[PDB]
Amino acid sequence: MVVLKVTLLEGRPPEKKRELVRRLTEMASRLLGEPYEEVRVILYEVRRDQWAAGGVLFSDKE
Amino acid sequence: MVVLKVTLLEGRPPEKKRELVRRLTEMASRLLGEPYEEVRVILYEVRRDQWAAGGVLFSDKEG
Amino acid sequence: MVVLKVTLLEGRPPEKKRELVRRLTEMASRLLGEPYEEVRVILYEVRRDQWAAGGVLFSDKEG
Amino acid sequence: MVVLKVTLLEGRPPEKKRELVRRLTEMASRLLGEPYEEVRVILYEVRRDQWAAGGVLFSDK
Amino acid sequence: MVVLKVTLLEGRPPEKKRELVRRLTEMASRLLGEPYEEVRVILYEVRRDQWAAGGVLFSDKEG
Amino acid sequence: MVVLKVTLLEGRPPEKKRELVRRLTEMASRLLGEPYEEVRVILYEVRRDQWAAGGVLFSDKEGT
């Protein structure tokens, strides 16, 4: 088993999440030689007021 | 201090969650000899639209 | 790059979150010779019904 | 499936860790109705020089 | 930006790891519209004696 | 309780880690109204062949 955790800002439409999960899964499965069904993906969506870069929260930089 | 982080799909009823937290604490305290106050449990509940296996998001669950 | 992840209970005012972030970034930046832009902070806010100490979920405490 | 991550200082005896994994799995499996093989445990062992409380690294006692 | 954390058993050859990182980076950048240079990947390689499934540590299962 | 996890490359000297842990514990204890004993810091040190930016692992960037 291999788990891919993607940290990204929330807001992505369902179709985009679905595409991302499908492509990452195919790629990891083949490349690592893991059973397709054994590849897990978790999307950790962060709020803009929970992520900062260069000392500034994205809720403010927005 | 010992921290048990449980990653599971959202949806479990409160009773089951409080029962899980209780059992994990009692076992961890015992087996590792940690004081109850030092045993912390964090429930990382993942949404159905954020949890995938076999390239399929649970929210898309084919069934 | 340096990543700081803060795990804390939900509920802190945006004012304090904003200051914690600026400060943690400054301290981490100078003490580690990392450029400002290369310092990231993520706030993992946990709900009261996902946070437990001593076998008790905070959502189960009165008040 | 369910994943249980245990963050604890390194140094515990192998049998304590084995027992912990076994007990955690049985209990999570039965309690959450998850198949025994679908329960996963990850032991995140932290070094004494990477763990602090009260501003003091445990390596510094 | 976007961070991809891969949790997998330790032991993969350097070439496998660099290809994995390249593939994940191009795909994440492509599908999410994130600058290729901003995509970060961290490999959380777990020891065989820290990874269990079905109540058994991989180190015991394999050895 | 507040937990601060710092992800950084392995290698910083003891004194530097000690100072980092002190300063961070100072700022967090202050702004979040938390007693020292309740501010935990974990240093998640990653090796150069486990961290990548722009599709390049720090290990390959430094050469072989």
Other chains touching E, judged by 3 or more CB pairs under 8 Å = A, C, D, F
Report the C-alpha gap between A19 and A25 in whole angstroms. Answer: 10
Question: What is the count of structural domains for chain B?
Answer: 1
Q: How far is CA E26 from CA A8, E4, E22, E31, E41, in A?
A: 16, 12, 6, 9, 11
CB-based burial label for E33 (10 Å; 0-12, 13-18, 19+)? exposed
- Partners of E57 in the beta sheet? E52
Report the length, in residues, of chain D. 61
> B17, B19, B46: best mutation site toward chain C, by most C Cβ within 10 Å?
B17
Helix (H) or strand (E) holding B8: strand B2-9
The CATH number assigned to the domain holding C61 equals 3.30.429.10
What is the resolution of the experimental data for this entry, in Å?
1.9
CA distance B22 to chain A (A): 26
List residues bridging with F56 in a β-sheet. F53
Residue B47 phi, psi (nearest 5): -75, 155
Asked if the Cβ–Cβ distance from B14 to C49 is below 8 Å, we say yes
Residue D47, classed as helix, strand or coil, is coil
Amino acid at A14: P
The string of DSSP letters for chain E reads -EEEEEEEES---HHHHHHHHHHHHHHHHHHHT--GGGEEEEEEEEPGGGEEETTEEHHHHH-
User: Which residues in chain F precede a discontinuity of more than 2.5 Å between C and N?
Assistant: none
H-helix or E-strand spanning residue B4? strand B2-9
Domain that holds residue D50: 1-61
Which residues is C9 bridged to in the sheet? C46
The burial of C24, by beta-carbon neighbours within 10 Å (0-12 exposed, 13-18 middle, 19 or more buried), is given as: buried
Residues 6+ apart with CB under 8 A from D50: D57, F17, F42, F43, F44, F45
d(CA A59, CA E24): 27
Largest CA distance in chain E: 45
Burial category of B28 from C-beta neighbours within 10 Å (exposed 0-12, middle 13-18, buried 19 and up): buried
Q: Across the strands, what pairs with A4?
A: A41, E6
Q: Do B27 and D20 touch (CB under 8 A)?
A: yes
E3 contacts in chain C (CB < 8 Å): 3
Tell me how far apart the alpha carbons of residues C4 and C27 are, in angstroms, rounded to a whole number.
Answer: 11
Whether A51 contacts A7, CB under 8 Å = no
Residue E19's identity, in one-letter code, is E
Contact D3 A3 (CB under 8 A): yes
DSSP class of E47: P
What pairing do the DSSP bridges indicate for beta strands A39-46 and A2-9? parallel
Is the distance from CB of D48 to CB of D58 less than 8 angstroms?
yes
Technique used to solve these coordinates:
X-ray
Residue D15: partners with Cβ closer than 8 Å, 6 or more residues away: none
Q: What is the distance between the alpha carbons of residues E36 and E27, in angstroms, rounded to a whole number?
A: 9
- Token pair 């429930």 in the structure block, residue: B43
Residue D41 DSSP SS3: strand
Contact A45, A5 (CB under 8 A): no
- Whether chain E lies against chain B with 3 or more Cβ pairs closer than 8 A is no
Number of residues in chain C: 63
Beta-carbon neighbour count of residue C33 at 10 Å? Answer: 7
